[PDB]
Symmetry: C6
Subunit: 200 residues, 6 copies
Amino acid sequence: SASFDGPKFKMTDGSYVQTKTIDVGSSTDISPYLSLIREDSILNGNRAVIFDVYWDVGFTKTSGWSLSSVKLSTRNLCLFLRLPKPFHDNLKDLYRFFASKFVTFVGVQIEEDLDLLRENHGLVIRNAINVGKLAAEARGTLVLEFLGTRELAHRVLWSDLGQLDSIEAKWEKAGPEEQLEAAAIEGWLIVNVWDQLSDE
Amino acid sequence: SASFDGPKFKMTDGSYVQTKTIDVGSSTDISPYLSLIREDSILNGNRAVIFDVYWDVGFTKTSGWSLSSVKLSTRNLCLFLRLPKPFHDNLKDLYRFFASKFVTFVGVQIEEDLDLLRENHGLVIRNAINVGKLAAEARGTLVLEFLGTRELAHRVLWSDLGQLDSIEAKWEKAGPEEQLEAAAIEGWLIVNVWDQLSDE
Amino acid sequence: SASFDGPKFKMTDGSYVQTKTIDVGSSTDISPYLSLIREDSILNGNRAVIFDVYWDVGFTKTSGWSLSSVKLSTRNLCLFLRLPKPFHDNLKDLYRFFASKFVTFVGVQIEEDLDLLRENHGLVIRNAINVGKLAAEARGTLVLEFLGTRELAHRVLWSDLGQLDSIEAKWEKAGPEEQLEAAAIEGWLIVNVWDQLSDE
Amino acid sequence: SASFDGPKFKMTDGSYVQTKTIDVGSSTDISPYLSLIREDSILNGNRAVIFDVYWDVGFTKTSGWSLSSVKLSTRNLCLFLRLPKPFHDNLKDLYRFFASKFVTFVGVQIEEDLDLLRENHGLVIRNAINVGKLAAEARGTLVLEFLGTRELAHRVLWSDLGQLDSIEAKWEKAGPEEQLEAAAIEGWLIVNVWDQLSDE
Amino acid sequence: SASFDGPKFKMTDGSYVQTKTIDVGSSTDISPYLSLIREDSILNGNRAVIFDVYWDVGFTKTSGWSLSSVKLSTRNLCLFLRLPKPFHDNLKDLYRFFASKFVTFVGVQIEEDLDLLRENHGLVIRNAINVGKLAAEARGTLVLEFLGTRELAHRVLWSDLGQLDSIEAKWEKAGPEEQLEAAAIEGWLIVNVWDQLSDE
Amino acid sequence: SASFDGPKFKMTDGSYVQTKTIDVGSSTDISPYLSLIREDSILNGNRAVIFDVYWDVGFTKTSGWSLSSVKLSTRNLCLFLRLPKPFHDNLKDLYRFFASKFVTFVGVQIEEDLDLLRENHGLVIRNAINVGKLAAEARGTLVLEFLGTRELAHRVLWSDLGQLDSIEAKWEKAGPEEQLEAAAIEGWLIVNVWDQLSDE
């Protein structure tokens, strides 16, 4: 079965979120996993796919960083790829995926990650939006442009952030489980941020 | 006589799009169809040609991308071109066409493709229009420059995208003619978005 | 001596455009015909000059793009310089005049062109205007920067464009003579587009 | 367990800034201190982390700038990290901190630092803000974009800075502990700045 | 003693301009003339000298172009310097004059000029301004930005340009002395253009 | 000991400025001199230092320029620095100076001056401002952004500049002490410009 069989997490408005963490290896087909997300975004999430990237530090002086992970969030799905260093050819599906015009790619503070993706991986997100700028602008409030995730979720939702803060506040001690929950939470939270700004 | 003898599709308006697919070689002459694209553009299309490009992704980093397909749509026609790698001289017709000032090349989210196209192929579209932004400014809706081909149509024309969302939701399993049909409805959706935008 | 003794065309408002075409080799003198345009442009056109360019696309990929000819139009004249490859020193006069302050160089869809001219042939134009943008602003119509040629002047001079549309509609079946008419007419139109713009 | 046993500096409002200065060697684990910064910022500072970097100038013409120290501040704590010459792997923690998204990074006059951090160490603060600008825009007082750490605190807050001015005025002669107080004073000060602008 | 011992020209406002021409070889001392320009721009020229440049085009492709001529003039004076290829140490003072902050350097279309001068001669103009460029905004007429030297004067001052128009209307049919006339008149007009935008 | 014992000059309002001129070789210690400027700046000079630079032009095309003169001005002191070529270790004291955010480095027409400092010497000014632009936004006059040092001061302070003007007008006949006089004057003027705008 190609389904999302990792832990479900309970949000704040009653809904839940699944899981699918893969230790992406050289011949790990991640396409069927990329399908759902797409299917879910198109049928259930208004065609937005929320994301985030994680970099292994490195040593142009930033040509050493490695794209160690990626988060993709829609209505009902979140996939966590723990990409390999270095990339193998099975990753074309990853590149092909990010170049699609079916969905807008939503992320917070991505200007830098995008140049990195370009210079260090040749990955192009043809349809991306750094969402803090549109947030601040749609609202005429400059400060939203310079907010991190948790805090950008607050100046747009106010939903209860206590649980997310308890995990983030103690991130050094948080096991892969609470760490995954924080990623699903803000992965869902930014979905709510975008629905609000564009459904407006 | 030079003709679009491929499958025909019906839009949410009884209209019928005439298609053609050329697997261009190193001795093929595609000029009779681009000329048919230009004619329908001038005579009955307010000199707009809508387009999209499709790359063979690759691993200077964005050096792996290579134009594998080009779609050119006019109100009446949709010309889908599957291209080889590398190009041969016979494709000079495509460069010459895209550099034309007779019509405006209407694309959706082509900012990265216009550049990868310029840098990777030398295919200058002197008169291209990333159509997105115009929408946001004209309609006074910030999110328009930030949507995929469909959602922009939905947000600008609010027509029926039923057949469209269905085929796209299950993309990796859609037959060839289903993928063409999706290209058709999008080509027709944007040729309408444009016609609706240049006159308001 | 020198005079525009080629085909003289009659415009829709009854005016005429004289013409001249030279098959520039590597020894000819093109000054004499450059004077006449600068004469008509200063005495009859008030430093108005409308041009267009044409490239040989060769297989940095745009490095091969070489200039094949240029169109220079004023009030009552249309000059055509068909260029060799490579260029010879007798062509220094086209460079000093295209980059002249004694006059300006109104172009339609020229940003890329300036790039190719400067970067590919050391061709600099110091006083240039990509007229769609000024047209768009001058008259509160965003879509004018994005129109190509016949539609900018349409949206702006609303003049008789049947004959023009009739020819370009079948560009491929047009004799080098009729293609002249189509170019002289769009040149005249654009000079008219600009005479209006500088006054608004 | 971790604590900050360096001196505290009861500010001017009666509060006490707890400080700590660490000499980072090739095996020093600073994760416990950064952990507490993020912890305090999140549970006590609204996820803002103000900062500043210290440069060793050496003899690209700017290739001789050497990041010798970095100051991180929340309302309760100010952490000083003084980097070793060979950056080993135990510094990837610092890098991962400047890259996180859990908090933001607000500095005074940081345009050349980040640019410089990016060129000499491969360090790109994913989410940071050059606050003088936000203050100028937020308040409509352009000049705020051009003030050093103090006139900015002065012109925005108008608080007592006698202790600070008297220390910086005789800077060449200031010893260790005194230097600590100046930056320390400036750390807490900028912490208040962002707090007063983030929601005004 | 060095003086402006060339012809004088009556301007249409009844005033006069004194001029000096010099072909620079290698042992030429131009400093006296520069001093006369500065003194007069300071004493009564309100510290804004009008300056224009001329090029020796030559087969980065534009790196063979040499700053062929340099015109430096204000109200009362005009200096024309024809340069050799390559420069000798005696042109350093031209580089220095062009660097002074005692005055503002004004010229028509300098955008490509400043680039070229920087790139092929290391000659930097530290305190420069595009006159027609400031002319446009200062008047709510976006097209003033794109005017050749004659028209800008025409459209901001609207005087009698018959004499100049007469000469720039038969360029090749004019001797060396006649070229200086237009140059010197080239100046006066911009001088008055600046003064109009002076206290507007 | 270290003090400003050069000529003292009387300004427009009867105040004075003390000078110091240092012929910096490889052994010169501007130490108590960078140190004294910092102080005068802090206690009595409104958190910034007015400053101007001057270049030695020698023959990348702009790499012949060598910073030969650094003028550092404050409330009461005009410190002067003539540099050697190339720099010795004794120039670390200088690089560190302009790296301080204790004061704002206010310059007039510094665009290229900040650019040459970077590519020529790798010298970085973190807290710099090209002040003419600020005056333009504040004082409501477009031109001030394009004014020289004296004209900007004239235009913002309507101060008597007869003294400065007479010296600048005949600059070639001015000796060392007369040029310092003018340099100290322009410094005082910009200092007065800075006090004025900071309050607006």
